[PDB]
């Protein structure tokens, strides 16, 4: 996260860190139920030297604050039993950039570990609304990962503006969130984590999945996010959640 601040301990108890074996933090995820996480499909693709698509290659850390303190009280470590990448995920465009990850054993809910609420299919997160992005990703483009979970406030951008800023690249599954002036943005390694939106009675719903962007916190290059409401039914069908 570029231009954000340190989160307080347990401020985002749905924020999860995914570590690939021997590689440390790779992607974010969100806790949606005792057994299920949401993340971005593009985190779980194989490359010539590592099988990121293999579930047994991962460890999820729940209630994590500091990447250097993975053994802190209240941190829970979990293996994965399954990765379901969206069937329409497109490695070239990042259309349908969403995966569901099945924890090998259920999470234990606690003051540090708690699911984010999921929005109904018909809910719209309107243009201009403030929402939060969180992660351990780069705090500058080309820069280094944050030890301490970062938070930053960004705003939903009108879809037409979004398509125009990033010609031939924005599909209706995607949503621009951040500022045309830059400054606050997610970045490499925040990918897969949630947008948190404070709703009418203060409960936090997931407004998107961190997906991609052109550098980070660049003028006229806001962060692009996989939408959540469009996937409510797909999540129910696959998870029971
Ligand atoms: N098809 C496209 N339009 C497109 C797709 C991806 C892309 O950039 C990527 C690619 C991989 C990454 N992803 S990631 O964390 O770095 C990653 C990369 C490779 C891998 F194998 C696993 C995980 C990425 O990260 C972000 C996310 C958000 C922002 C932002 N809000 N400014 C910036 C970077 N960004 C840029 C463009």
mmCIF file of C-alpha atoms and ligand atoms in Angstrom:
data_model
loop_
_atom_site.group_PDB
_atom_site.id
_atom_site.type_symbol
_atom_site.label_atom_id
_atom_site.label_comp_id
_atom_site.label_asym_id
_atom_site.label_seq_id
_atom_site.Cartn_x
_atom_site.Cartn_y
_atom_site.Cartn_z
ATOM 1 C CA UNK A 1 0.000 0.000 0.000
ATOM 2 C CA UNK A 2 1.426 3.388 -1.073
ATOM 3 C CA UNK A 3 0.609 6.494 0.947
ATOM 4 C CA UNK A 4 -1.016 4.591 3.811
ATOM 5 C CA UNK A 5 -0.334 4.214 7.538
ATOM 6 C CA UNK A 6 0.275 1.428 10.006
ATOM 7 C CA UNK A 7 -2.982 -0.438 10.871
ATOM 8 C CA UNK A 8 -3.733 -0.882 14.569
ATOM 9 C CA UNK A 9 -3.305 -4.421 15.778
ATOM 10 C CA UNK A 10 -6.473 -6.473 14.886
ATOM 11 C CA UNK A 11 -8.062 -3.541 12.949
ATOM 12 C CA UNK A 12 -8.697 -5.727 9.903
ATOM 13 C CA UNK A 13 -9.282 -9.204 11.384
ATOM 14 C CA UNK A 14 -10.439 -10.463 7.946
ATOM 15 C CA UNK A 15 -7.104 -9.576 6.303
ATOM 16 C CA UNK A 16 -5.061 -12.726 5.642
ATOM 17 C CA UNK A 17 -1.442 -13.213 4.367
ATOM 18 C CA UNK A 18 -0.660 -16.076 1.874
ATOM 19 C CA UNK A 19 2.920 -17.399 1.959
ATOM 20 C CA UNK A 20 4.282 -19.762 -0.673
ATOM 21 C CA UNK A 21 6.660 -22.348 0.663
ATOM 22 C CA UNK A 22 10.114 -20.838 1.162
ATOM 23 C CA UNK A 23 9.122 -17.492 -0.302
ATOM 24 C CA UNK A 24 7.322 -15.489 2.341
ATOM 25 C CA UNK A 25 4.276 -13.307 1.766
ATOM 26 C CA UNK A 26 2.979 -13.388 -1.778
ATOM 27 C CA UNK A 27 -0.614 -12.335 -1.795
ATOM 28 C CA UNK A 28 -3.434 -11.109 0.404
ATOM 29 C CA UNK A 29 -6.723 -12.829 1.019
ATOM 30 C CA UNK A 30 -9.905 -12.186 3.035
ATOM 31 C CA UNK A 31 -11.574 -14.425 5.549
ATOM 32 C CA UNK A 32 -15.290 -14.991 4.541
ATOM 33 C CA UNK A 33 -16.274 -17.959 6.772
ATOM 34 C CA UNK A 34 -14.573 -20.487 9.158
ATOM 35 C CA UNK A 35 -13.405 -22.460 6.076
ATOM 36 C CA UNK A 36 -13.136 -20.081 3.095
ATOM 37 C CA UNK A 37 -11.055 -17.264 1.882
ATOM 38 C CA UNK A 38 -11.357 -14.911 -1.096
ATOM 39 C CA UNK A 39 -8.202 -13.870 -3.075
ATOM 40 C CA UNK A 40 -7.122 -13.116 -6.673
ATOM 41 C CA UNK A 41 -6.772 -15.919 -9.250
ATOM 42 C CA UNK A 42 -3.532 -14.472 -10.608
ATOM 43 C CA UNK A 43 -1.765 -15.338 -7.375
ATOM 44 C CA UNK A 44 -2.290 -19.069 -8.027
ATOM 45 C CA UNK A 45 -0.738 -19.581 -11.492
ATOM 46 C CA UNK A 46 2.350 -21.710 -12.098
ATOM 47 C CA UNK A 47 5.612 -20.408 -13.473
ATOM 48 C CA UNK A 48 8.628 -22.444 -14.638
ATOM 49 C CA UNK A 49 10.210 -22.477 -11.204
ATOM 50 C CA UNK A 50 7.257 -22.733 -8.806
ATOM 51 C CA UNK A 51 3.784 -24.302 -8.813
ATOM 52 C CA UNK A 52 1.716 -21.485 -7.322
ATOM 53 C CA UNK A 53 -1.453 -23.335 -8.398
ATOM 54 C CA UNK A 54 -0.764 -26.233 -5.990
ATOM 55 C CA UNK A 55 -2.674 -25.775 -2.635
ATOM 56 C CA UNK A 56 -0.157 -27.740 -0.695
ATOM 57 C CA UNK A 57 2.420 -25.059 -1.560
ATOM 58 C CA UNK A 58 0.701 -22.448 0.661
ATOM 59 C CA UNK A 59 0.338 -21.286 4.225
ATOM 60 C CA UNK A 60 -2.316 -18.780 5.267
ATOM 61 C CA UNK A 61 -1.742 -16.555 8.276
ATOM 62 C CA UNK A 62 -4.853 -15.215 9.993
ATOM 63 C CA UNK A 63 -4.867 -12.439 12.652
ATOM 64 C CA UNK A 64 -1.388 -11.487 11.450
ATOM 65 C CA UNK A 65 0.017 -7.987 12.133
ATOM 66 C CA UNK A 66 3.746 -8.063 11.593
ATOM 67 C CA UNK A 67 5.362 -10.337 8.916
ATOM 68 C CA UNK A 68 8.339 -10.680 11.325
ATOM 69 C CA UNK A 69 6.063 -11.951 14.138
ATOM 70 C CA UNK A 70 4.132 -14.823 12.592
ATOM 71 C CA UNK A 71 4.172 -16.669 15.943
ATOM 72 C CA UNK A 72 2.609 -13.840 17.944
ATOM 73 C CA UNK A 73 -0.368 -14.647 20.254
ATOM 74 C CA UNK A 74 -3.643 -14.780 18.294
ATOM 75 C CA UNK A 75 -1.954 -15.442 14.906
ATOM 76 C CA UNK A 76 -3.401 -18.640 13.355
ATOM 77 C CA UNK A 77 -1.520 -20.688 10.694
ATOM 78 C CA UNK A 78 -3.503 -22.781 8.251
ATOM 79 C CA UNK A 79 -2.816 -24.956 5.283
ATOM 80 C CA UNK A 80 -5.018 -25.009 2.169
ATOM 81 C CA UNK A 81 -7.014 -27.989 0.972
ATOM 82 C CA UNK A 82 -8.194 -26.470 -2.356
ATOM 83 C CA UNK A 83 -7.794 -23.374 -4.686
ATOM 84 C CA UNK A 84 -10.773 -22.678 -6.972
ATOM 85 C CA UNK A 85 -9.723 -20.138 -9.623
ATOM 86 C CA UNK A 86 -12.630 -18.537 -11.451
ATOM 87 C CA UNK A 87 -13.271 -20.571 -14.647
ATOM 88 C CA UNK A 88 -13.321 -17.386 -16.711
ATOM 89 C CA UNK A 89 -10.088 -15.946 -15.348
ATOM 90 C CA UNK A 90 -8.043 -14.539 -18.198
ATOM 91 C CA UNK A 91 -4.291 -14.451 -17.522
ATOM 92 C CA UNK A 92 -3.799 -11.737 -20.206
ATOM 93 C CA UNK A 93 -6.530 -9.238 -19.294
ATOM 94 C CA UNK A 94 -6.979 -10.297 -15.622
ATOM 95 C CA UNK A 95 -10.727 -10.502 -16.283
ATOM 96 C CA UNK A 96 -12.459 -12.628 -13.523
ATOM 97 C CA UNK A 97 -9.420 -12.246 -11.210
ATOM 98 C CA UNK A 98 -10.852 -14.064 -8.217
ATOM 99 C CA UNK A 99 -10.193 -17.347 -6.366
ATOM 100 C CA UNK A 100 -11.641 -19.148 -3.364
ATOM 101 C CA UNK A 101 -9.227 -20.899 -1.058
ATOM 102 C CA UNK A 102 -10.411 -23.700 1.220
ATOM 103 C CA UNK A 103 -8.709 -23.760 4.594
ATOM 104 C CA UNK A 104 -7.497 -27.213 5.568
ATOM 105 C CA UNK A 105 -8.877 -26.756 9.087
ATOM 106 C CA UNK A 106 -11.407 -24.021 10.135
ATOM 107 C CA UNK A 107 -10.290 -20.699 11.393
ATOM 108 C CA UNK A 108 -11.050 -19.967 15.104
ATOM 109 C CA UNK A 109 -12.951 -16.686 15.384
ATOM 110 C CA UNK A 110 -11.458 -14.318 17.964
ATOM 111 C CA UNK A 111 -10.952 -10.577 18.480
ATOM 112 C CA UNK A 112 -8.111 -10.805 15.809
ATOM 113 C CA UNK A 113 -9.790 -13.261 13.434
ATOM 114 C CA UNK A 114 -13.173 -12.514 12.000
ATOM 115 C CA UNK A 115 -14.855 -12.717 8.556
ATOM 116 C CA UNK A 116 -15.666 -9.676 6.465
ATOM 117 C CA UNK A 117 -19.307 -9.415 5.383
ATOM 118 C CA UNK A 118 -20.177 -10.246 1.757
ATOM 119 C CA UNK A 119 -22.376 -7.867 -0.281
ATOM 120 C CA UNK A 120 -25.603 -9.107 -1.979
ATOM 121 C CA UNK A 121 -25.669 -9.502 -5.808
ATOM 122 C CA UNK A 122 -27.690 -6.304 -6.334
ATOM 123 C CA UNK A 123 -25.576 -4.042 -4.053
ATOM 124 C CA UNK A 124 -23.708 -1.161 -5.766
ATOM 125 C CA UNK A 125 -20.728 0.525 -4.203
ATOM 126 C CA UNK A 126 -21.309 3.983 -5.573
ATOM 127 C CA UNK A 127 -18.885 6.375 -7.244
ATOM 128 C CA UNK A 128 -17.156 8.651 -4.761
ATOM 129 C CA UNK A 129 -17.627 6.347 -1.713
ATOM 130 C CA UNK A 130 -14.565 6.087 0.664
ATOM 131 C CA UNK A 131 -13.271 2.537 1.160
ATOM 132 C CA UNK A 132 -10.148 1.002 2.627
ATOM 133 C CA UNK A 133 -7.375 -0.985 1.081
ATOM 134 C CA UNK A 134 -4.990 -2.994 3.339
ATOM 135 C CA UNK A 135 -1.920 -5.209 2.737
ATOM 136 C CA UNK A 136 1.762 -6.012 3.262
ATOM 137 C CA UNK A 137 2.599 -5.127 -0.325
ATOM 138 C CA UNK A 138 5.068 -2.524 -1.618
ATOM 139 C CA UNK A 139 4.856 0.870 -0.008
ATOM 140 C CA UNK A 140 6.281 2.364 -3.237
ATOM 141 C CA UNK A 141 6.348 1.252 -6.865
ATOM 142 C CA UNK A 142 9.638 -0.754 -7.271
ATOM 143 C CA UNK A 143 9.941 -0.368 -3.495
ATOM 144 C CA UNK A 144 9.876 -3.088 -0.452
ATOM 145 C CA UNK A 145 7.012 -4.861 1.346
ATOM 146 C CA UNK A 146 5.623 -3.472 4.615
ATOM 147 C CA UNK A 147 6.436 -5.418 7.814
ATOM 148 C CA UNK A 148 3.435 -3.909 9.590
ATOM 149 C CA UNK A 149 -0.011 -4.243 7.876
ATOM 150 C CA UNK A 150 -0.788 -0.972 6.022
ATOM 151 C CA UNK A 151 -4.141 0.710 5.504
ATOM 152 C CA UNK A 152 -5.050 3.512 3.037
ATOM 153 C CA UNK A 153 -8.307 5.304 2.236
ATOM 154 C CA UNK A 154 -9.245 5.484 -1.487
ATOM 155 C CA UNK A 155 -12.504 6.254 -3.347
ATOM 156 C CA UNK A 156 -14.616 4.395 -5.877
ATOM 157 C CA UNK A 157 -14.081 5.949 -9.372
ATOM 158 C CA UNK A 158 -16.924 6.254 -12.020
ATOM 159 C CA UNK A 159 -16.709 3.237 -14.432
ATOM 160 C CA UNK A 160 -16.630 5.318 -17.626
ATOM 161 C CA UNK A 161 -13.729 7.399 -16.218
ATOM 162 C CA UNK A 162 -12.006 4.094 -15.378
ATOM 163 C CA UNK A 163 -12.401 2.593 -18.936
ATOM 164 C CA UNK A 164 -11.086 5.917 -20.359
ATOM 165 C CA UNK A 165 -8.079 6.098 -18.115
ATOM 166 C CA UNK A 166 -7.008 2.533 -19.087
ATOM 167 C CA UNK A 167 -8.271 2.095 -22.694
ATOM 168 C CA UNK A 168 -9.026 -1.497 -23.806
ATOM 169 C CA UNK A 169 -8.292 -2.848 -20.431
ATOM 170 C CA UNK A 170 -11.302 -2.426 -18.120
ATOM 171 C CA UNK A 171 -14.103 -5.031 -18.190
ATOM 172 C CA UNK A 172 -17.355 -4.836 -16.186
ATOM 173 C CA UNK A 173 -15.846 -7.276 -13.553
ATOM 174 C CA UNK A 174 -13.297 -4.556 -12.797
ATOM 175 C CA UNK A 175 -13.610 -1.376 -10.708
ATOM 176 C CA UNK A 176 -11.214 1.633 -10.421
ATOM 177 C CA UNK A 177 -10.693 2.739 -6.751
ATOM 178 C CA UNK A 178 -8.115 5.312 -5.573
ATOM 179 C CA UNK A 179 -7.516 9.077 -6.793
ATOM 180 C CA UNK A 180 -6.805 10.426 -10.267
ATOM 181 C CA UNK A 181 -4.097 12.570 -8.511
ATOM 182 C CA UNK A 182 -2.373 9.190 -7.236
ATOM 183 C CA UNK A 183 -0.695 9.223 -3.837
ATOM 184 C CA UNK A 184 -2.764 6.470 -2.175
ATOM 185 C CA UNK A 185 -2.963 3.059 -3.950
ATOM 186 C CA UNK A 186 -2.406 -0.616 -3.434
ATOM 187 C CA UNK A 187 0.720 -2.145 -4.950
ATOM 188 C CA UNK A 188 2.612 -5.490 -5.727
ATOM 189 C CA UNK A 189 1.817 -8.013 -2.878
ATOM 190 C CA UNK A 190 -1.430 -6.313 -1.798
ATOM 191 C CA UNK A 191 -2.926 -8.328 -4.657
ATOM 192 C CA UNK A 192 -5.623 -10.803 -3.495
ATOM 193 C CA UNK A 193 -6.467 -8.730 -0.362
ATOM 194 C CA UNK A 194 -9.907 -7.089 0.264
ATOM 195 C CA UNK A 195 -11.329 -3.626 -0.095
ATOM 196 C CA UNK A 196 -13.171 -2.926 3.143
ATOM 197 C CA UNK A 197 -16.229 -0.689 2.882
ATOM 198 C CA UNK A 198 -17.875 0.774 6.035
ATOM 199 C CA UNK A 199 -21.643 0.313 5.487
ATOM 200 C CA UNK A 200 -24.872 1.944 7.086
ATOM 201 C CA UNK A 201 -24.517 0.666 10.641
ATOM 202 C CA UNK A 202 -20.547 0.556 10.574
ATOM 203 C CA UNK A 203 -20.215 -3.123 9.530
ATOM 204 C CA UNK A 204 -17.485 -3.756 6.929
ATOM 205 C CA UNK A 205 -18.347 -5.369 3.642
ATOM 206 C CA UNK A 206 -15.916 -6.522 0.955
ATOM 207 C CA UNK A 207 -16.011 -4.130 -1.969
ATOM 208 C CA UNK A 208 -13.328 -5.675 -4.180
ATOM 209 C CA UNK A 209 -10.251 -7.810 -4.605
ATOM 210 C CA UNK A 210 -6.893 -6.119 -5.195
ATOM 211 C CA UNK A 211 -6.090 -7.122 -8.799
ATOM 212 C CA UNK A 212 -3.754 -4.875 -10.822
ATOM 213 C CA UNK A 213 -2.652 -1.354 -11.785
ATOM 214 C CA UNK A 214 -0.149 0.462 -13.971
ATOM 215 C CA UNK A 215 2.869 1.093 -11.389
ATOM 216 C CA UNK A 216 1.316 2.307 -8.154
ATOM 217 C CA UNK A 217 -0.067 5.605 -6.884
ATOM 218 C CA UNK A 218 0.633 7.155 -10.410
ATOM 219 C CA UNK A 219 -1.416 10.124 -11.630
ATOM 220 C CA UNK A 220 -4.278 8.906 -13.780
ATOM 221 C CA UNK A 221 -3.498 5.251 -12.972
ATOM 222 C CA UNK A 222 -5.816 4.220 -10.085
ATOM 223 C CA UNK A 223 -5.779 0.655 -8.772
ATOM 224 C CA UNK A 224 -8.071 -1.833 -10.528
ATOM 225 C CA UNK A 225 -10.080 -4.262 -8.397
ATOM 226 C CA UNK A 226 -12.224 -7.299 -8.984
ATOM 227 C CA UNK A 227 -15.821 -6.438 -7.980
ATOM 228 C CA UNK A 228 -17.583 -8.562 -5.243
ATOM 229 C CA UNK A 229 -21.364 -8.319 -5.763
ATOM 230 C CA UNK A 230 -21.034 -9.907 -9.236
ATOM 231 C CA UNK A 231 -19.612 -13.009 -7.566
ATOM 232 C CA UNK A 232 -22.003 -13.477 -4.612
ATOM 233 C CA UNK A 233 -23.785 -16.362 -6.377
ATOM 234 C CA UNK A 234 -20.551 -17.959 -7.566
ATOM 235 C CA UNK A 235 -19.246 -17.850 -3.995
ATOM 236 C CA UNK A 236 -22.475 -19.445 -2.639
ATOM 237 C CA UNK A 237 -22.470 -22.203 -5.268
ATOM 238 C CA UNK A 238 -18.871 -23.148 -4.606
ATOM 239 C CA UNK A 239 -18.537 -22.691 -0.831
ATOM 240 C CA UNK A 240 -21.993 -22.883 0.742
ATOM 241 C CA UNK A 241 -21.193 -19.350 2.114
HETATM 242 N N1 LIG B 1 -3.725 -7.201 -17.921
HETATM 243 C C1 LIG B 1 -3.556 -6.050 -17.282
HETATM 244 N N2 LIG B 1 -4.216 -5.016 -17.568
HETATM 245 C C2 LIG B 1 -2.595 -5.972 -16.161
HETATM 246 C C3 LIG B 1 -2.481 -7.063 -15.318
HETATM 247 C C4 LIG B 1 -1.609 -7.002 -14.259
HETATM 248 C C5 LIG B 1 -0.876 -5.840 -14.085
HETATM 249 O O1 LIG B 1 -0.032 -5.695 -13.066
HETATM 250 C C6 LIG B 1 0.142 -6.494 -11.987
HETATM 251 C C7 LIG B 1 0.525 -7.810 -12.160
HETATM 252 C C8 LIG B 1 0.762 -8.539 -11.030
HETATM 253 C C9 LIG B 1 0.694 -7.907 -9.781
HETATM 254 N N3 LIG B 1 0.691 -8.757 -8.794
HETATM 255 S S1 LIG B 1 1.334 -9.398 -7.579
HETATM 256 O O2 LIG B 1 1.248 -9.151 -6.163
HETATM 257 O O3 LIG B 1 2.496 -8.648 -7.870
HETATM 258 C C10 LIG B 1 1.768 -10.853 -8.107
HETATM 259 C C11 LIG B 1 2.533 -10.919 -9.280
HETATM 260 C C12 LIG B 1 2.912 -12.134 -9.828
HETATM 261 C C13 LIG B 1 2.535 -13.307 -9.209
HETATM 262 F F1 LIG B 1 2.912 -14.485 -9.756
HETATM 263 C C14 LIG B 1 1.767 -13.261 -8.048
HETATM 264 C C15 LIG B 1 1.380 -12.035 -7.503
HETATM 265 C C16 LIG B 1 0.265 -6.634 -9.647
HETATM 266 O O4 LIG B 1 0.127 -6.107 -8.401
HETATM 267 C C17 LIG B 1 -0.459 -4.872 -8.299
HETATM 268 C C18 LIG B 1 -1.703 -4.699 -7.697
HETATM 269 C C19 LIG B 1 -2.261 -3.423 -7.598
HETATM 270 C C20 LIG B 1 -1.567 -2.327 -8.114
HETATM 271 C C21 LIG B 1 -2.146 -0.950 -8.012
HETATM 272 N N4 LIG B 1 -3.239 -0.775 -7.413
HETATM 273 N N5 LIG B 1 -1.510 0.095 -8.520
HETATM 274 C C22 LIG B 1 -0.332 -2.519 -8.727
HETATM 275 C C23 LIG B 1 0.223 -3.781 -8.814
HETATM 276 N N6 LIG B 1 0.029 -5.931 -10.762
HETATM 277 C C24 LIG B 1 -0.984 -4.738 -14.918
HETATM 278 C C25 LIG B 1 -1.860 -4.811 -15.980
#
